[model samples]
Target: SLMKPNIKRVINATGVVINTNLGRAPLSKDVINFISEIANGYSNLEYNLEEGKRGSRIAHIEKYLNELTGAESSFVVNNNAGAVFLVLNTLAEGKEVIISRGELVEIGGSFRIPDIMKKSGAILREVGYYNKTKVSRYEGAINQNTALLMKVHKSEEVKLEDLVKLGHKYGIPTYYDAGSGLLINLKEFGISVDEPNFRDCISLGIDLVSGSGDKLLGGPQAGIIVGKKNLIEKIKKNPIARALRIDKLTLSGLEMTLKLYFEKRYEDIPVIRMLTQDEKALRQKAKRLEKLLKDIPGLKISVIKDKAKPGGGSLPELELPTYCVAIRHDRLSSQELSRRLRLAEPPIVCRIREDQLLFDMRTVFHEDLKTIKKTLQELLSI
Candidate 1:
C-alpha cells in the first residue's frame, strides 16, 4: 500500500519569520522559479562547462560566498551542525577545543555544542561561568594541548575580537559557530540586535566560522562555512565533508539565494523584507485583512498592534513591531475557531492570545489574505 506524504503547504500567520516548524525562510518567487527550472532539467552541477571536464559542486557557491563575506574560501554542507562538525573533526579531533561554559548552547532539537564537539572526536575544555566568562578565563584554559579556541555566538561577556587576539597570542585557531549566518547588519533598519555578521567575523581574523543558511540568510536549509583559506581547505578535505555535502537541488537554491545577496537585492529576500517591513504598511495589511473578514455575521475582527519574532533560534530577544488581525467568534470559543481553521483546506497556523485568535500580518503573505478569508468563510458557514 502506498501512503501519501502529509507535508502539504500551510499558511503561516504565526508571525515568526523563519518559523522552523512551518519551514524556515519561505523562498522568494525568484528563488522558487529558479529552483523549479533547475529541478525540471539537467544542470552542470559538477561539470566544468568551459573546460569540458568534471568539476566540483562546491565551486558553484564558493566564489559568491568568498566575494560576499571577504573570506578567502567558503562552502556549504547539509546544515550548520555539519559545518561545525567538519571544522572540529578536521582541525581539533582528539584535541582540546577551549570554550566558555556559557557558550555551550543547545539550539533547536536539543543540538548542543558540547555533544557536537564530543561526536567530532574533540575534547571539551570548559571555561568561565554560564552568565559571564572573561578573557582571562579563556586564556587560563589554553595550553599546548588546546587545538582550537571555539566560540559560540550566544550573548556572552567575551567578544570575538578578544578571542581572535587571544588565539593569535597562543598560536591557536579560532572557530565561531555563528549560528544564524547573518549576512548583513539590520541595526540601520531599526532591528538593533547585537548579532554578528559573516563579514565581521571573517575580517576580525576568526580562522573559521559556520552558520545556518536557513535562518538569517533567508535561504534553503544549509550550513555555510567561510573563513581563512587554509582552514577552509582542510575542512573541505576531510572525509566527513563528502558525507555532509549538499545535493543539486539544495545547491541550486542556495546558489540563487547567495546570488541575491551578491547582487545587493536584499529586499528580494523574503526574510529581510519581512524584518524590515514598515509598521504603517503592516497596519494597512492588517486593516485590509480585517475588512475582508468584517462582514462575517457572527465574527468579530480588529486590527491590533502586535509583536513578531525572528524565530528559528535567531535573535533571541528581539521583537519586530507589527499588526495582527485579532478575531473572536460569536458562537464558537476562540479555541474552537482556531481548531476549525487549522482543519481547513490549507491549514491556517496562527497564534492564540487572551481568548482571541491572531493572524499576524507580518508573516502572512499578501496572496494568503484571500485564502485566509475564504477558509474562515467556509469554517463559519459549517
Candidate 2:
C-alpha cells in the first residue's frame, strides 16, 4: 500500500474550478453520441470513402468552421496559442509582426504573446500606445519585410475598432487571436458581453482569425484558424502544423460542437446556457440552496451578488452577473473551508472573501444544487 499511490477523486471546490478535461462546455446529447460513437469504433476520419483514398484530417471540421464563420476555409490545431505560433512560424518567421502594446497579454503559465513570438523566430515590432493604436501607426510600422499585422482580441470592457482598417490599408495581412470567440448571438438571449464572434473577423477582412474551440465557443480545446483559402494552405504545409496538431477525439468533438452552432442548438452550449439564464431563475436556485443550509444554527446564509467570469482565458474584463448563497461559520478557516468543500462526496465549489464562502449561481445549475447543499451541511458539522 505504501508503494502504490491511489488516485483520489476529489471535487473541484475552487470557484474557478471548471471541467476542462471531462468536458469544457457541457456536451449535448447529440454531441455526446457523436463522441461516443467515434471513440468507440473506427472512423473514416482521415479517409475519403468516396474514392477510398487517404484523406487529410483537416477535412473533418473544415466545412463546418467555414460555414459558421463565413471564412474561405479553416483548420484546427491544439489551441489558440498553438494557432498563433503556427501562423507566425509559417508566415512571419525571420520577419516583423506589428502589434499594439496594449494587447500584449500574459495568460496562465506565463504564455505571453511576445514570448511566443520570440520563440517562433519572429521579431516583435511594437506600434501604438497601450490603450489606443491608429491606422497610421500600422501603416508607419510597415516596411518591405513586414509579414503580418497581429491583433489579439482583448475581451476587456472596451473595444478597438480602427486597427483592423489600418492593417488592411497597408496591404499587410492582419491576424487576430480571437480567443474566447463567442458565436451564439447572445443579443438574442439578452446576455451582455462584448466578446468577439468569428463572423465579425471574416467580415472585417481579417486574413486569418484564430479562435478557441473551448472557451466562448463551448467546445473541445481547439485552436481554430478560419480565413482565406491561401492562408489555410500555408498553415497546412508548415511543419509546425504536424507538431501542434489535434487528436482524432478532439477533432470529432470539435466537429459536433460546430454543427450544433449551425443548427441553433442553444442548450448544447453549456456556457451560453449558464449565461443566458434570467435573474429570476437564478434567484430561485440560490434561495433553494440557502433553504437547505439554513437549518444550521451557527451558520449565516443569505443571497448576494457574486461575480463569475467567462473563464478559460476568454474574457478577462467581462464579469458575469450572478446570485449567490453566502455562508459563514466558525468551524474552519477560509482555506480549510475550501479544502473540506473540495473533499466532499460530489464536491461544492465556491468563492471565498474575507473569511466568507459564496456559492454563486452563475455557473452552478439545477444538477449542482444538491451537491452544494450536501457540501454545506457537511462543512458546518466539521
Candidate 3:
C-alpha cells in the first residue's frame, strides 16, 4: 500500500518547465539521494558538533543563502506565503503597509495579497491604478503610521530601486515578494524576462525579499526570506517562525541544491537545464521520439515546432521556442488518447492541440522516452 500511495509520480510532457501540478521543480538525483540519506539517519539539524551544544536550525541554510544572494541574513519557512506572512506580522502588524493597486496579486490557491495582509494584522493602504502606478503615488500614501513599503513582483511598472530609495527617505523598510525566487537572470541564457534575481533585489537595498524555493530555485518546497541583518533577526525572533519552520528533509534538499549553485553545476539542476536547452536539442529529442513511435499502427506522428513556458507562475509572458512530438491516432480521438495516456501505468501529462497529443520535448527527460514508447504501445494495443 505504501508503494501504491495516492500521490504517484507522473511523466511531465506538458513542456511547462516548472509544472506546479507535477511537483513544481524536480530535484537533481544527488539532491534527492542526499535528502534520503538525511531522512534515513539522524542529522545534527539543530546541534553544533563543533561546539557540542544546541544550535539554531536556521544556521544550516542561512550562510549559503547569505553568500548566494549577498544578503545580510536569510531564513526559510514552509512556503513563500508563510514568508510574506511572517514578514508582515513581524514588521507591519497593526500598521499601514503601502502597496500599488496593480501589485495586489492573487497567488496560486486563491491566496490574495490583501487577504494575507489582513490576516497578518497589517493595514492595507492601496494607492494608484490597477494598470500603472508612479513612484510619487507610493510617496503620497506614506504617513506617520506607515510601517512598510511593500511591492509584489510580476511585470511591475514602478522601479524597485526608486521604491527602495523612497522607503529609505521616509525611514520605512521596503519588502519585495519575489514570488518565483529567480536566482539568476534568464536573459543571459537567451530567455528574456523582467523577473528580478535575488542578488539584484538584495543589491537594490530592499529591506526584505521573499521567494518560493520550489519554483525557479529548483529546490524543495520552502519559503526563502533574505534581507538586512537587523530586520531578518527580528523576523527570526517572531513566535510564528517556529510554527512555520521547515523540516530536516527540506533543509537537506535545499542545502544541497544551493551547494550545486555554489559549485557552478548549473546544468545539474533540471529546471535550469530545461530552461536553457537549445531549440536544436529539443528538435533532436522530438525527432528521436517520432522515430520510436513512427511505425506504430494507426498512429500519425511528426516533430513540430512549438513554444514552451516556464510555468508555476514564474515567467508569465516569456515563451521558449522548442519542439514536440505530435501524435494523432486514426482510430482514437485526441481526447480519448489523452485520457488513455493519463491512465497509463506512469501517466503521461501532455498538451492537447487541435487533434493531436503534444509530447513537448522541453520538459521530457531522455530516460523517460523508453517508458513513454512502451506505455503508448500498450495503450494502442487495446
Better of 2 and 3 by lDDT: 3
TM-score per candidate, chains pooled? 0.95, 0.90, 0.95
lDDT of 3 by residue, 42-104 (tens): 889999999999999888888999988999999899989899899999999899999888778
Q: Which ten residues in a row have the lowest lDDT in candidate 2?
A: 9-18
Worst window of 10 by summed lDDT in candidate 1: 105-114
Write model 1 residue lDDT over 289-377, tens digit each, in one string. Answer: 99899878798888898666655455565677889998998899989988888888789999899999999988898988999998898
At residue 88, give the lDDT of candidate 2: 88
The C-alpha RMSD of each candidate to the native structure, in angstroms, is: 2.0, 3.1, 1.7
Candidate 1, which segments miss by more than 4 Å at Cα?
1-5, 188-190
Backbone clash total, candidate 1 = 0
Error of 1 at 122 (Å): 0.8
- Native-vs-model 3 lDDT? 0.87
